[PDB]
Amino acid sequence: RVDPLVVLFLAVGFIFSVVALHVISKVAGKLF
C-alpha cells in the first residue's frame, strides 16, 4: 500500500544510515 515516493524515502534512509554507520565506525576506530 506504500506509495512509490515512500518507497524511495525509506530506501534512501536505509542506505544513508548504512553509509553513515560505516564511516562513523571508521571514526570510532581511528579517532575514537
Binding site: P4, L5, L8, F9, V12, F16, V19, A20, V23
Partner: protein, 487 residues
C-alpha cells in the same frame, strides 16, 4: 586497499581530457550541422498594442570552453615529459586521503541523499498535482462540481462561464494578491476592450492561461453531456479571443477597425461578410466610415483571409468494408472546402470526384487519418487583443438526437489548408467560368472517429454534428446526418 591512486600527478589528466572530449564532440558536430502561405505574421503588428508587445516579449558555448580546456591540458601534458602489475586509478591521491576527503564525502552524501530525494519528490508532487491535459486538479474538481450542482434550470451566459473561470486556482497561485471576485470584472473590462487599472500585465497573463483553461472545461463538460454548455464554452472562447462580448452582429465586429457606436447606429442589418462583399468597394468602406485607402485595403485583405466551411459529401465510413453493420465502429467522413464569401456555390458535379474518394492502399485502408495528417497546419490567427500569436483551431463535436446530449470527447482539428483563399485566385468574385484552376482547390478532408460503437439493432439512426470555428465568428458549420444499419 588493493589499489593505487597515482599521487605522481602524471597519470590522470589525460583521463578527464578524453572522458570529456568525447562528451564535447557530439555537441560540436551536431551544431556545425549548419509549407502553407501565412498572411498575418507581417501584419498583426499593424494592430497590436505596444503594451502587448512589451508583455509578450517580457514574459552552445560550453563547447568552446571545453575546447579551451583541451588546449590547456594538451600543452600541459606535452610540457610534461612523462614482476610488474599495478592497480592504477586516475584521480590524484590528495583527493583520496587529503583534508579535502571529508569534504568530498559529505559533498557526495549531501548530493545524493538530499539533492536527489528532494528534487524527485518536488517533481513528482508537481506532476501528480496536474491532470492529463495541463489543468490543475483543484480547477478540475471545481468545474466538475460547479457543473453537476449546476441545475440546468439556469441558462448559460458568457457572464456565467466567466464566473466559473473566476475560480482558476492556478491563477490564485500566481496572483495571491487579489480575488476572483475581481478577476471577473477584469475579464469583463478586458472583453470590452476597455483598459483595466494597473493590471494590464495581469489580464494579459490571465487570457494567456484562459485559453487552455477553457479547452479543459470544454472537455469535461462535454464528457459530462451538456451540449448547451459546450457550445457556450466555444462561443465564449471566440469572445475571449476577439475581445468582444457575444452580440448578434459581431460577425463584423471581429474586424481590425470599425466605427463601433457610429456604425451600430447607422446600420444593423449587416451581419454577413457576404453582405459586406455584396455592396461596392467604395460603398462598403463608405458605410464603414474610415475613408482611408490603406485601412480599407488592410480590412479587405484580412476579411478575405478569414475562413469558412461548406459541406461536401458528408457521410459515414467503415474501414475495409463499405456497408454499415450492427455493432460496428464507423467513423465520420466529410471532405469539405474553404471559402471566404467570395467563391460561392461550386457544384458538386464540377469536381470529377476521382480526386475526392479515398484510395484503397491497404494499410491506409486500415489506418485512416494518415492522408489528412499529411496536410499542413492552419496559419496564425489575427486576434489583436490576444497576447501571443496563435494558430487557428477547429472544434468538431457530435450530438445524438435521442437526448441532445453530447456523446464523446470533443475532437480538435487543426490540420487544414487555406490555399483556396490566396489572391492568386481572387479573380473569382461575386460580381462565373473564365480561366479558373479547377484542380487547385484542395478538398479539406475531415475524418472523426466515434468512441461508442454502432448499435446492435438495425435502422436509420439520426445524428447532428457541428464544427465550430475557434477564434472567428465566421460561417461555422452545423449539419445533421443519419446511418442505416443493413446487415
Amino acid at each position: 586497499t588493493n589499489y593505487e591512486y597515482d599521487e605522481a600527478s602524471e597519470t590522470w589528466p589525460s583521463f578527464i581530457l578524453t572522458g570529456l572530449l568525447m562528451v564535447v564532440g557530439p555537441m560540436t558536430l551536431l551544431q556545425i550541422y549548419q509549407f502553407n502561405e501565412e498572411v498575418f505574421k507581417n501584419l498583426n503588428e499593424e494592430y497590436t498594442s505596444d503594451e502587448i508587445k512589451q508583455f509578450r516579449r517580457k514574459f552552445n558555448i560550453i563547447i568552446i570552453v571545453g575546447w579551451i580546456l583541451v588546449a590547456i591540458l594538451l600543452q600541459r601534458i606535452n610540457s610534461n615529459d612523462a614482476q610488474s602489475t599495478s592497480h592504477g586509478i586516475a584521480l590524484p591521491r590528495f583527493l583520496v586521503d587529503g583534508s579535502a576527503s571529508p569534504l568530498l564525502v559529505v559533498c557526495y552524501v549531501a548530493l545524493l541523499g538530499l539533492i536527489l530525494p528532494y528534487f524527485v519528490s518536488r517533481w513528482w508532487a508537481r506532476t501528480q498535482s496536474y491532470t492529463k491535459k495541463g489543468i490543475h486538479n483543484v480547477t478540475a474538481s471545481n468545474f466538475v462540481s460547479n457543473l453537476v450542482n449546476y441545475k440546468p434550470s439556469e441558462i448559460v451566459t458568457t457572464d456565467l462561464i466567466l464566473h466559473w473561470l473566476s475560480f482558476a486556482h492556478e491563477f490564485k497561485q500566481f496572483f495571491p494578491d487579489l480575488q476572483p471576485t475581481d478577476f471577473e470584472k477584469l475579464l469583463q473590462d478586458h472583453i470590452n476592450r476597455r483598459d483595466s487599472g494597473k493590471l494590464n500585465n495581469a489580464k494579459f497573463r490571465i487570457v494567456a492561461k484562459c485559453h487552455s483553461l477553457l479547452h479543459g472545461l470544454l472537455d469535461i463538460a462535454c464528457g459530462f453531456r451538456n451540449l448547451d454548455i459546450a457550445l457556450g464554452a466555444i462561443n465564449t472562447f471566440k469572445c475571449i479571443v476577439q475581445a468582444v462580448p457575444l452580440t448578434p452582429n459581431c460577425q463584423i465586429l471581429q474586424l481590425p477597425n470599425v466605427d463601433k457606436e457610429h456604425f451600430i447606429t447607422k446600420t444593423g442589418d449587416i451581419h454577413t461578410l457576404g453582405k459586406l462583399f455584396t455592396l461596392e468597394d467604395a460603398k462598403i468602406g463608405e458605410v464603414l466610415g474610415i475613408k482611408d485607402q490603406a485601412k480599407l485595403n488592410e480590412t479587405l485583405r484580412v476579411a478575405s483571409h478569414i475562413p469558412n466551411l461548406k459541406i461536401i459529401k458528408a457521410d459515414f465510413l467503415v474501414p475495409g468494408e463499405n456497408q454499415v453493420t450492427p455493432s460496428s465502429t464507423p467513423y465520420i467522413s466529410l471532405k469539405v472546402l474553404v471559402r471566404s464569401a467570395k467563391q460561392p456555390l461550386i457544384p458538386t458535379s464540377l469536381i470529377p470526384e476521382e480526386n475526392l474518394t479515398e484510395p484503397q492502399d491497404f494499410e491506409s485502408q486500415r489506418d485512416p487519418f494518415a492522408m489528412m495528417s499529411k496536410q499542413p497546419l492552419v496559419p496564425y490567427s489575427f486576434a489583436p487583443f490576444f497576447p501571443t500569436k496563435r494558430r487557428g483551431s477547429w472544434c468538431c463535436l457530435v450530438s445524438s438526437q435521442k437526448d441532445g446530449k453530447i456523446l464523446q470527447t470533443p475532437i480538435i482539428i487543426e490540420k487544414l489548408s487555406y490555399k483556396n483563399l490566396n489572391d492568386d485566385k481572387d479573380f473569382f468574385d461575386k460580381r462565373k467560368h473564365e480561366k479558373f484552376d479547377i484542380n487547385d482547390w484542395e478538398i479539406g478532408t475531415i475524418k472523426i472517429p466515434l468512441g461508442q460503437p454502432a448499435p446492435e439493432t438495425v435502422g436509420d439512426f439520426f445524428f447532428r454534428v457541428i464544427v465550430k470555428s475557434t477564434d472567428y465568428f465566421t460561417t461555422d458549420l452545423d449539419i445533421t446526418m443519419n446511418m442505416k444499419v443493413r446487415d
